[PDB]
Amino acid sequence: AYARTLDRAVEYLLSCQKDEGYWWGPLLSNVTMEAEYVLLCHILDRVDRDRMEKIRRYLLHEQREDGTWALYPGGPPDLDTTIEAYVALKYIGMSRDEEPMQKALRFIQSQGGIESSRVFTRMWLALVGEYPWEKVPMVPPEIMFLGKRMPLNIYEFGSWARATVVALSIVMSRQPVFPLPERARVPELYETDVPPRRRGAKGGGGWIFDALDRALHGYQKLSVHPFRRAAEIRALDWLLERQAGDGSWGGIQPPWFYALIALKILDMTQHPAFIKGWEGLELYGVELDYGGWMFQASISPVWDTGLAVLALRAAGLPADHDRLVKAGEWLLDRQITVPGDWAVKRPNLKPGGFAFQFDNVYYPDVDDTAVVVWALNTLRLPDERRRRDAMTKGFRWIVGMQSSNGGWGAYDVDNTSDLPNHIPFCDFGEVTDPPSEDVTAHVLECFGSFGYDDAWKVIRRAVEYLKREQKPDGSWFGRWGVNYLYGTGAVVSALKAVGIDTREPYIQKALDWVEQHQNPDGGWGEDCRSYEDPAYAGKGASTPSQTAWALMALIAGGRAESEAARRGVQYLVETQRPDGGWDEPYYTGTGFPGDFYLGYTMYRHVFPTLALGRYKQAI
Amino acid sequence: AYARTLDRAVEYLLSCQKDEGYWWGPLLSNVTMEAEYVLLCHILDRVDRDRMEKIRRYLLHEQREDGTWALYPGGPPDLDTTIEAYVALKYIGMSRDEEPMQKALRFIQSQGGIESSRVFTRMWLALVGEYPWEKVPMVPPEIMFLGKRMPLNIYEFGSWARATVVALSIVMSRQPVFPLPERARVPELYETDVPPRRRGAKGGGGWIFDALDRALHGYQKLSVHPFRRAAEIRALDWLLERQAGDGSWGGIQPPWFYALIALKILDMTQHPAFIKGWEGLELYGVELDYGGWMFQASISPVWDTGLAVLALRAAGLPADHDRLVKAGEWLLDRQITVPGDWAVKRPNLKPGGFAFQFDNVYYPDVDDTAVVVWALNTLRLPDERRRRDAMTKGFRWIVGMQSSNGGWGAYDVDNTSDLPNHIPFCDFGEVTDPPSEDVTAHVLECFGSFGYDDAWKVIRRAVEYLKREQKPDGSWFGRWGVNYLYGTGAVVSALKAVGIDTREPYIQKALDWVEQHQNPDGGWGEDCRSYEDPAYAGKGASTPSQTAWALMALIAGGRAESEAARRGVQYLVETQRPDGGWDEPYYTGTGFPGDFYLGYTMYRHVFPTLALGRYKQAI
């Protein structure tokens, strides 16, 4: 039956492999990436008319009939996103009359205008001079002085936030304005009666911070700020030290853009970091077949390559397949051997992790490290010396990263402070990196592949971690994947791996929850709305990836025979394309719960292959 | 007569122009550049077997019949240079038996061996493990803490020494060792009886510094050095902030190499700065037609371009000639508009100078700025707006750089401290950048082209400076050019330009001195030995460039009619090649009096052209 399905998927995946030996599917997000790129180009005075064109085509192509844009396909209109998209289009050349402009402008106004937008959106506008800097939450360069132990020192913020903050403190320190030509001014973003419905910090606006921010904006006003020139040079030096090999900063779109702006601010455009910073951008861009061009919020080569290998194995190719070997080799040259920001809390830990992107040594993550180490463990490469050593280095790095509560975070250990969540600036996404269920599960299944189990204290703490975190209904949250089906799929798959007993009560209570959501069409799906309204936990249009997740929980929990199981397998088998792939017009990946979603374009292919190989495995 | 000479010189000069519009002759020095390159490649573990071949080929080619190498062609053998050359060749592959190696080992031994070499040479050896680090003068990263006003703070050292020091302080901080394979160990450098004749600091060893060095070497021994980790990061940050666009550091070979080593030291090979620093090297290398390869101590495009223009004008081409225009334009895009290290002593000075090389924004120099500004002032470019503005900025920057005594240094204002000259480490070359006669002369002739004169305070102080510096015999020293003919040629040329009277006594006393040294062949020459032994002042084989310098002093002083003058012109006319060039197998350029000489390969063509055009001018 499914045999042919799997056989076709395998040859498909094997076809998508790049020459050097890795897999790399584009990462999808929302249009703020390209909208901000347009503004960035204006700031830096490097606008390519041809490029703007491809971006115009893209922006429009992404707009929906109602004239809005969303965080994910089939999602509610997003005010922030739509505002930026508007400004972008207007700049590129479209007049406010045009149908597209009109519908958008309407949505925007019916929402209270610009005053209802997140800090980032008002700050971008602040940069081009379409909004008062005085109304934008300050993050002073002095932040650079707070030492290792102290409220709000930069290491209390998560890796992604950290860099962004350092970068911005230079920007906000100078509050510069790069005027838009008259044709593009967007005063209409104010023309509304609807009362501004302001969004507050991700944790609550304690009156102290409102005061503190008011103080800072006042201190901005003064004629002299002692030691500020130094606070700035601190920020700058902090950035020069960590710039990634590809010219970016963290391999992510935000700080990369803000750093380039800061460099421009400091009259440093003729400097090596700026140049390399700028030219590196092209690697993240993508030529869309319909004449458009998008920019990736980040790139996922390691991740893709890691899972690709794991699936192609569970499927059936031999641990020494000449094709998997190329992958295994490539992965070995990616291991990070130098200390990164993580070392600030673990000075005596031997580096051995990996990163999401191609070259980003200072920010390896647990998830990628666990997947890569595990995936390697399943291969047989020529140099058995290196495979052995690398795993070892990576293995230990992971262990050494295990946070206090027994669970693993992504970038740091115990980056669990609560303080950062309350400042004015932090109104969008996460801002700290606490441990999560999904990463922990992946770490756990990593170890399990080796043969470690319940006995070893390490695991024990993790499992206890996972158990205290299970939701009432038996489900597990999904931090970096959408959502309960993602988490649950992982946890159960993991626990099975570390030797626990699939028969225990809470394991069953989870296994049951899965079956209870199988959609009529014999597969599973979960819409991104499940981060906002709980009515959507387990609910959504059936996707190939989420189906595979559910199937894995089922297969791990012993219920491979179950009807739900077979039914699921049917879905993946019927919905497969003639070439081997699977489509998936929905995002099944998470950036930040409620605020930012991602579409891992390889998930649709890899997980179904992996889930199927595991079904065949249990027979 | 000379008309044809001049015509052929022009069409030749014009032929050497590059497309983008500038001139760029290779800069010649000594083999320590290539020898150190070889060791650097070993340190960085990036040895190209083919490149080594082209290097072995050059190294041998430059060795004299006696088996030694010198600082300049036709010069005494140099211990330092020969030692490094030796080690380089041994590493590349030649055994200590070979004819060339034997002769060399002899000279080296007859001198007291390795113990008689400069700090830099023992330090390079120290790096590959062929010499105890304990015997190498220390320069601690803590140097980084000394503030603006304090003995030995880094801004008390000249621009070139500064960067080198910062770089090395990280290296000496860690005292690393990159062992040579056994085949290349060079213990024989010790095998000698001749008593070591140690070279001391450029100014004398005050017992304080020996004490200080001895303490510093003892402190190295300790198990913990508080605040050192900071000191290091201070140096690295100072270094990452100043890297040149071409990836170098200061556009000179020394700090560039040391910085790369320090980055290697700091486990930062996959950092943007390291990568750029490494790949930038190629631009400085040169393929020699006989199969060898050399590395330039530095590059002189701006300088070459500036003089080229000035000569082709004095020569006869129209101030709007299309070729000189390409040049004028190119020169405008080179003006530096941001502040450099010089601003530390002149915070309110508007940047507007130029550099020697292509892209080196933090280190513009008075000499290049004066020549470029002056040259621009003789052209008529399309955008007269920009020529007008550029000159004004350059002009004012120069004025703002005039040191206390009334003269001009090359990179800084009053970099006249005497303290640095006594520390153990400083045993080779200059280490501070005090004002010099030749740069001042050039600045003066620059203003003169605009018409300013004796009445403007600025010029008055400068002339008073030059007068207090004239030598007893009426000659003027040559800091950056070889030597008394270079300086005298300039001063007289300058003073004539600022309106002073060529009839005054001291002007005549100098003019006379020039005629006094005309060689029998009706031209002038001055050997590099004149920095060591005064019996060589004005004496040496005739060279085309030095002839031109003498001729300019003669022409400026009114004695164009003079027999010496005519005779000189005869020389330049008889010795000219069929194509229009002129040969010159001697170095006529100075790096550091006594210690480092340069061969500006364009001098032989440009000055004779300039001199001749000025002869024709006065008729």
Ligand SMILES: C=CCN(C)CCCCCCOc1ccc2c(-c3ccc(Br)cc3)nccc2c1
């Ligand atoms: C599942 C395993 C792979 N790991 C590796 C997770 C991959 C997620 C990294 C890609 C997303 O990176 C970011 C990180 C921060 C982002 C921010 C952001 C938000 C708040 C602050 Br304050 C600063 C930046 N804004 C917009 C987009 C972003 C994408």
Ligand SMILES: C=CCN(C)CCCCCCOc1ccc2c(-c3ccc(Br)cc3)nccc2c1
């Ligand atoms: C004449 C007009 C152009 N100006 C612009 C002068 C051009 C000279 C710059 C090229 C030489 O640059 C250097 C500078 C320093 C050099 C050092 C050196 C010596 C002692 C220390 Br302490 C550090 C470096 N060693 C070896 C070689 C060098 C060449």
Ligand SMILES: CCCCCCCCOCCOCCOCCOCCO
């Ligand atoms: C630069 C001094 C050498 C410091 C030794 C390396 C130890 C660094 O401490 C780790 C924690 O600091 C955060 C990031 O390190 C990454 C980039 O800094 C690079 C230079 O070390």
Ligand SMILES: CCCCCCCCOCCOCCOCCOCCO
């Ligand atoms: C970095 C914030 C300081 C901004 C003021 C610019 C003043 C720079 O000082 C000039 C002299 O200092 C040495 C070098 O300057 C070059 C590199 O520093 C770059 C960023 O300014």
